[PDB]
């Protein structure tokens with residue numbers, strides 16, 4: 448019992464892949480299934496200049512990540528940080544409640560990748 | 576304007592502290608404020624035998640972590656994994672919408688600590 452939008456993003460996920468040498472990297476595992484979600488970001492002019500995700504997880508996780516990465520592309524870091532699964536709640540309505548977990552991977556990995564980038568920036572400016 | 580339950584868990588948070596040499600460790604940062612949530616778990620008989628959190632974050636993050644860790648204490652790993660912020664949505668009703676992010680740290684760190692423990696266990700399988 449899924450949604451048309453989820454079906455579209457599972458069948459034709461956007462932004463699948465890897466970035467070599469990314470500016471930010473975030474990885475989160477779902478321990479139930481043991482699936483791992485990785486987000487890679489490139490940052491230019493404090494905007495998401497490129498984003499990719501890689502997972503072997505389930506339909507729900509893949510479709511959520513496709514929607515989240517699409518939303519994030521070309522936004523400022525601060526805007527991207529404010530994205531949560533809540534921003535695509537309507538597309539996810541009526542999913543089995545155990546797919547809640549799967550749907551949280553995307554946003555949590557994105558937030559991790561952004562924090563990764565930001566902490567690198569902080570370290571660079573240790574003494575300045 | 577906050578909830579009475581949130582006020583109680585912010586003023587008297589349960590399970591604050593650290594576990595030295597924990598069975599599972601999970602850390603997640605909120606990049607907006609730069610606050611970091613750490614969860615420590617001890618695992619005995621595939622149950623949460625001890626849990627502690629450590630953060631310097633905001634009231635919302637602290638109260639959520641107090642509620643989440645209290646829910647997790649003494650549950651099986653599998654039950655604990657199924658906990659999300661959704662399980663305390665009622666207590667969190669009407670929080671400023673930016674505290675959604677803060678409220679997700681707790682569950683995400685707990686899930687990270689459980690994955691940490693499980694992957695350590697996975698090491699044994701390499702034995703052949």
Ligand code: FES
Pocket residue numbers: 477480481482503504505506507508549
């Ligand atoms: S089971 Fe691996 S993501 Fe749904």
Ligand code: FES
Pocket residue numbers: 605608609610631632633634635636677
């Ligand atoms: S301000 Fe850092 S946790 Fe909400």
